[PDB]
Amino acid sequence: PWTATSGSCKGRCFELQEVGPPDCRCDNLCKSYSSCCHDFDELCLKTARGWECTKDRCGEVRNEENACHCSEDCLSRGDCCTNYQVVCKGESHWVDDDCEEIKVPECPAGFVRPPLIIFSVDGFRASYMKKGSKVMPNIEKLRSCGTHAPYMRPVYPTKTFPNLYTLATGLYPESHGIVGNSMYDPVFDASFHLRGREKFNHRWWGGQPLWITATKQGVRAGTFFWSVSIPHERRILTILQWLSLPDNERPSVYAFYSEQPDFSGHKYGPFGPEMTNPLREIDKTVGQLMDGLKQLRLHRCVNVIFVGDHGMEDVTCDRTEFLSNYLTNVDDITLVPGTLGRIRAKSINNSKYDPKTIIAALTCKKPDQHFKPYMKQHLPKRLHYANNRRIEDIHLLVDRRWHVARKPLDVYKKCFFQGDHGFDNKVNSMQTVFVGYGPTFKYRTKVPPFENIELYNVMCDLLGLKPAPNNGTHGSLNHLLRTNTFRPTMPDEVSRPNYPGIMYLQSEFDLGCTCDDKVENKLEELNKRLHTKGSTKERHLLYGRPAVLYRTSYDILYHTDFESGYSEIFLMPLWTSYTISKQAEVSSIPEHLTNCVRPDVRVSPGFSQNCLAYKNDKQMSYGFLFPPYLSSSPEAKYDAFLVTNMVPMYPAFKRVWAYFQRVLVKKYASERNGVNVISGPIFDYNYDGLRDTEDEIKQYVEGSSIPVPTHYYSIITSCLDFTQPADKCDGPLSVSSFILPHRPDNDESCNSSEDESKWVEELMKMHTARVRDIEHLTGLDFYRKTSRSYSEILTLKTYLHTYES
Ligand SMILES: *[C@@H]1O[C@H](CO)[C@@H](O[C@@H]2O[C@H](CO)[C@@H](O[C@@H]3O[C@H](CO[C@H]4O[C@H](CO)[C@@H](O)[C@H](O[C@H]5O[C@H](CO)[C@@H](O)[C@H](O)[C@@H]5O[C@H]5O[C@H](CO)[C@@H](O)[C@H](O)[C@@H]5O)[C@@H]4O)[C@@H](O)[C@H](O[C@H]4O[C@H](CO)[C@@H](O)[C@H](O)[C@@H]4O[C@H]4O[C@H](CO)[C@@H](O)[C@H](O)[C@@H]4O)[C@@H]3O)[C@H](O)[C@H]2NC(C)=O)[C@H](O)[C@H]1NC(C)=O
Ligand SMILES: NC(=O)[C@@H]1CCN1C(=O)COc1cccc2nsnc12
Ligand SMILES: [Ca+2]
Ligand SMILES: [Ca+2]
Ligand SMILES: [K+]
Ligand code: NA
Ligand SMILES: [Zn+2]
Prior knowledge:
Elements: H1 40-44, H2 74-77, H3 84-88, E1 116-122, H4 128-131, H5 137-145, E2 147-148, E3 152-153, H6 160-169, H7 173-176, E4 183-185, E5 190-192, H8 210-216, H9 232-242, E6 253-261, H10 262-268, H11 276-295, E7 303-308, E8 313-314, E9 320-322, E10 333-336, E11 340-345, H12 355-361, E12 371-375, E13 394-398, E14 403-405, H13 409-412, E15 419-420, E16 434-437, E17 445-446, E18 450-451, H14 455-462, H15 523-532, H16 537-540, E19 547-548, E20 554-558, E21 563-567, E22 572-580, H17 611-616, E23 621-624, H18 634-637, E24 646-649, H19 651-672, E25 675-682, E26 711-719, E27 733-741, H20 760-766, E28 768-769, H21 771-778, E29 780-781, H22 790-798
Parallel strand pairs: 1-6, 1-7, 2-17, 3-18, 9-14
Antiparallel strand pairs: 2-16, 4-5, 7-16, 8-15, 10-11, 11-13, 12-13, 19-29, 20-21, 21-22, 22-25, 23-24, 25-26, 26-27, 27-28
Helix pairs in contact: 9-11
The chain binds a molecule of 8 linked components (NAG-NAG-BMA-MAN-MAN-MAN-MAN-MAN), the ligand NC(=O)[C@@H]1CCN1C(=O)COc1cccc2nsnc12, calcium ion (2 copies), potassium ion, sodium ion and zinc ion.
Potassium ion is lined by residues 614, 617-618, 620-621.
């Protein structure tokens, strides 16, 4: 675009409404667009005499050339140096004052709501709060007096633009569209990059960021972006001047952004000796804001959020893997490189390109290989990184401390750097910070770690806004807040279950199944009837039946050892619930029952699986959701071979599933003092993170209507106080969950030729999940009947067990 830069910034410095080219701009982004009026530096970026009042400037004659003022009129003009009251009026720095609870907002007249200030710091690693604590007194006072988490989990990839835009929208990058710091959109045929002009185009930027949500609901917003050449002292002074505007003109929400400590972290590594100075400097900027707020009498009015986008790991040029050491055809691919890999064909005119051969050439080729290839639909579902045309089908998950590059020349026609980020968002070095301070946040409160996708909802709660639809779980962070909590109701159940009794004779079934189960006592005849009508259901279903939130046809089936919700549409359980006490015994499948499958006389032949389909399907076998190994008695074991408990399983997956059921469930019950397990299938053939309808299923057991799951889940719940058994717990719960990919090979696990005891648990840890992730993939709602507050249950449903030490 052309700009007539001969207009003037007189009286317009850091104006909030941006004017359209060809008119010249005076806003905090004009520099980045080469569009400022000729006099912007002169008028808007004054530097004379620097940023601090000195004793000799106190009561000076106003000089409009000064960067900031120490004259008597400065407080009414809103343009004092932040230290004016300290130097000139005997006041204390905010950091030197005792922490005093802010029970109510203490705001000047005309303030309709406590303003919100988001203070975002690039590359601020979680452990900086403890390791830098001696040189960050302002930050340590926000942290200790307010509400803090030990860390906040970013989104993947743990890069700047994806994380800042997730902070602004509450969306996963797959949904907001900023899926990396570099991208190719094949529909646009356009490329997005850090340097350059394409990234300004609005088409990259999906969802509804907080400043737009605010503006649409009548709440005014400061501009959230700052041109890199505007010094931090000037950003802070601009925020404080905006806070002196008249009521009708004054924003309610503001953002400050620091490029540090990321900028230095890339050069020196996360804990380089050079990193102390950048931490001191950020702390000094926080001190400037808080002193400025105290001058304006806003320091007990404003909610301040101190938040990072991601951490920083040790990474050097010598720890690079080269695709040229794996692929013959390296010139036929494009790689997006570094702390992740994304691969596509160099040319869409190349009908020679085959993803299968590239994946195979990159799979377990070298004993200490520092990346793992995936088709994007096979990535751990917790990453939510697939449902976007900008995310390449082929992905490389790079080990922490490493890079991937196409060939060696890429690394020295561009060592230098000692830090980088972008790795798996569960990696400890990638975690970042959260502090909330103000009237609306709690006083001196620690909260558990949480994900950055949750903050948009809370920022909306802080400003009285209705959030746009997002990936947060609204209410899961109510424990951060003194007031403005959001009081959600549980979703309504959409489908009520049937409770079938005995309706079918054995001879009505023609399923091609056999079982050696013909073995005839009137004591345990009343008992079996009691078990089938749900006499043990209180033991095995501890948190109520899951609610089905979509329209479907399903049956509740009771058994001595487990309860299921059996889908007449999918011909298998949606869910299977069972409790395993610390004392439970593991047993074998008796030799005579190895191939036993039994018709369920509560369920019609036409709503049943059949064994003939599994015999004819040479790729597919079957497993059971309730494990026969954990049967309470020889007689109860027959229930586990019901055709209503069977699910399709590739033999390679049955190795994983059998080890989980035979070894790991009992191990968890031993360690956690009992566990409640809910297991089931997931169908996500379009990798959108959402339950498939039946018309989206791409694979069936050959010759049948039996759909093949993409994944199997388990939710494993126990008492947070492990002195109480899982089935008699009086207080909060503890959960871990997974979503295992249902794959026909174990190529993901490079050690899979060894015994399951060396690789299966490591696979399961990689595919750790939130209960909320399973809710999206299944249309079920769990924990409907506990003694716990709903907000606490929402917090439990967002918990991720990360298995970092
Ligand atoms: C995380 O939270 C988010 C937000 O809540 C969840 O995402 C939502 O999920 C819904 C279902 O997947 C989805 O609703 C669909 O969207 C269509 C309307 O879309 C536009 O409008 C909204 C509102 O302003 C806007 O946000 C959208 O933004 C997307 O697209 C723009 C421009 O392309 C992007 O810049 C932006 O980043 C975003 O991209 C992301 O989402 C899209 C899908 O919209 C993906 O394709 C991208 O990869 C990326 O992830 C849009 O501008 C609506 O038209 C749909 O309705 C059809 O679907 C069914 C199925 O048959 C049918 O019954 C309907 O009547 C209709 O059918 C017809 O169209 C079909 C599809 O073309 C066609 O096949 C049929 O044959 C018919 O012709 C549908 O309602 C909603 O858009 C997104 N929103 C966002 C912001 O992403 C997300 O699910 C959560 N994640 C998890 C894991 O929980
Ligand atoms: N000028 C710049 O390019 C620097 C680098 C980030 N940026 C900022 O000034 C602050 O940046 C953001 C704040 C909120 C949402 C965002 N989505 S992507 N970047 C965002
Ligand atoms: Ca960053
Ligand atoms: Ca789906
Ligand atoms: K088979
Ligand atoms: Na393998
Ligand atoms: Zn960086």
